[PDB]
Structures are given as structure tokens and as C-alpha cells.
Design goal:
CATH superfamily: Peptidase S8/S53 domain
Subcellular location: Secreted
Oligomer: monomer
CATH class: Alpha Beta
Keywords: Disulfide bond, Hydrolase, Protease, Secreted, Serine protease, Signal, Zymogen
Distance between the termini: 9 Å
Number of domains: 1
EC number: 3.4.21.-
GO biological process, one term: proteolysis
Radius of gyration: 16 Å
Largest sheet: 7 strands, parallel
Family: Belongs to the peptidase S8 family.
Strand order of the largest sheet: 4-5-3-6-8-10-11
Shape: globular
Length: about 280
């Protein structure tokens, strides 16, 4: 167990039962041997903070690289050296959204099955994760694709949505079999924009999260898209430390989670906050 001093709040929060720490405590295994696919606007794999552990390998949009930054930020929270949860994990960028931030249903689905097939040919001994920080209106097609990816042996973490309503009307968030992620702020209050409801499985840091950005810079933004990679990284971390299965990982994260500390969690929604068991 090592301690990253002065780490960004999201990392400090998932490594401690209570607010107050300025450090990120985590096991040195740091997710080594695990793989995390980021289905978003792409990942600027040239960012120095990835130490070459990130690779943008597929695009279904107009361009082939992340010209927005959203996907790079999520990738950064997953495993960048300075802002990441699993600092030694391998990251793969799958671009399904154009640089504006939008993409077709067909391309989003195609991004999911691509992960399902590609991960089979990659050396990912500890296991594979799919991080989906995207969420539009309800879509059976999106839910089915996410379900297929999950069933194929990949742990899928998806954003709950930012409509401040039940995530039942958001996809892939509404898919029962995936791990749906809500967002919280540094004072343990549900993010003002975070969706909720029975379909949400876990909450993680999502308000004012700092991470990698395009141009080799950094940025601080908010959204369930920021909370999702905390969970994606946590699973990669657990895979590399205690192992586990893709099908039991969401439940494992719920079991380990810090309970009853969040404010504004309506009855019927789980008051579970991501915890890595490092302290």
C-alpha cells in the first residue's frame, strides 16, 4: 500500500471511509495486467501522463483521434499516473463520438461489440473493463449491446446520466446487467445533476474532477461521465489485486463500498460510495 500525497479529491475519496484525506492510498499492483477500454470521444494516447500505457485503437466517427478531451479525461481518471485509479493498467481508446460529443446509435453499438471482440485478442491476464461515459434517452439497442458486452466477459461500467431524474430513462444506464454509476461531490452530496433510482448500482466522485485533457493539459469538469471511470478504474484495480469475475465485480464493489454517508440519496436508491479497501 502506497500513498500519493496531494492527490485530486476523487482519488482521495475512494480510498478512505471518511472525507478529510489529502492522499490517495492504493496497492502498488495498481491494476497491472488488467485492461480498460474507454468508449467515448477517443483517447489522446500521446498525453505524457499515460506513460505510453494508453493506445487509441479504433474510431467510428469522422476523425480518428480525440479532438474534444472528454474521452481523454475519462481515460485519465481510469489510469493516468497523476490522476488515475489504476496507475499501471493498460488503456484502449474506442472513439464512437465525434469531437462535438455526439454519435449515432449504430456507431455506439459498434463500439461496444468491438470491445467484446478486441479484448479477446489482447493480453489482459487480470481481466477486462469497458468504461462508457455516455448516456442518452432509453434505447433497447444500446441496452442489448451493453448486455452482450457484459455477458461476453467484460465488466461494463456505465454513466447513470445527468438529468437529475431516475436513470430508468437513460441508456445504457438502464441495462440491469451492467454497473450503473451515479455521481457525488467532495462533501458527500449527490451531484446536483446525477440521476438516481433503483437501476443505479454505485456512486463515485463526479463533481469537479481533475484529469488529463487534450493538448497534454488537464481539466476539471463534472458529470456521471467522470464518476464512471472511477468505477472502471476501481474494477481494474481489484482485478489486479484480488482478482474477481466480470459478472460479480459490480456486486463486489457494492459490498466493499462505504455505506450511508451520502446526502440527497432518495429512498429506493443505494447509498453506496466507491471504496478500494486500502485503509
Amino acid at each position: 500500500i502506497t500513498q500519493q500525497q496531494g492527490a485530486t479529491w476523487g482519488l482521495t475519496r475512494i480510498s478512505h471511509r471518511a472525507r478529510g484525506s489529502t492522499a490517495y492510498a492504493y496497492d502498488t499492483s495498481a491494476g497491472a495486467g488488467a485492461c480498460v477500454y474507454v468508449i467515448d470521444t477517443g483517447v489522446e494516447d500521446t498525453h505524457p501522463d499515460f506513460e505510453g500505457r494508453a493506445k487509441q485503437i479504433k474510431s467510428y466517427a469522422s476523425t480518428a483521434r480525440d479532438g474534444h478531451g472528454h474521452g481523454t479525461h475519462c481515460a485519465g481518471t481510469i489510469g493516468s499516473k497523476t490522476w488515475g485509479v489504476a496507475k499501471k493498467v493498460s488503456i484502449f481508446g474506442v472513439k464512437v463520438l465525434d469531437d462535438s460529443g455526439s454519435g449515432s446509435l449504430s456507431n455506439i453499438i459498434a463500439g461496444m461489440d468491438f470491445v467484446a471482440s478486441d479484448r479477446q485478442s489482447r493480453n489482459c491476464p487480470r481481466r477486462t473493463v469497458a468504461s462508457m461515459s455516455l448516456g442518452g434517452g432509453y434505447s433497447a439497442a444500446l441496452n442489448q449491446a451493453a448486455a452482450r458486452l457484459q455477458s461476453s466477459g467484460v465488466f461494463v461500467a456505465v454513466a447513470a446520466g445527468n438529468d437529475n431524474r431516475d436513470a430508468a430513462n437513460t441508456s445504457p444506464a438502464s441495462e440491469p446487467t451492467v454497473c450503473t454509476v451515479g455521481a457525488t461531490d467532495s462533501n458527500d452530496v449527490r451531484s446536483t445533476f446525477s440521476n438516481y433510482g433503483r437501476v443505479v448500482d454505485i456512486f463515485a466522485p463526479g463533481t469537479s474532477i481533475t484529469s488529463t485533457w487534450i493538448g497534454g493539459r488537464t481539466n476539471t469538469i463534472s458529470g456521471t461521465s467522470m464518476a464512471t471511470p472511477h468505477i472502471a478504474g476501481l474494477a481494474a484495480y481489484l482485478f489486479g489485486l484480488e482478482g474477481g469475475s466480470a459478472g460479480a465485480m459490480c456486486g463486489r464493489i457494492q459490498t466493499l463500498s462505504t455505506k450511508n454517508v451520502l446526502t440527497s440519496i432518495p429512498s429506493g436508491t443505494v447509498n453506496y460510495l466507491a471504496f478500494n479497501g486500502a485503509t
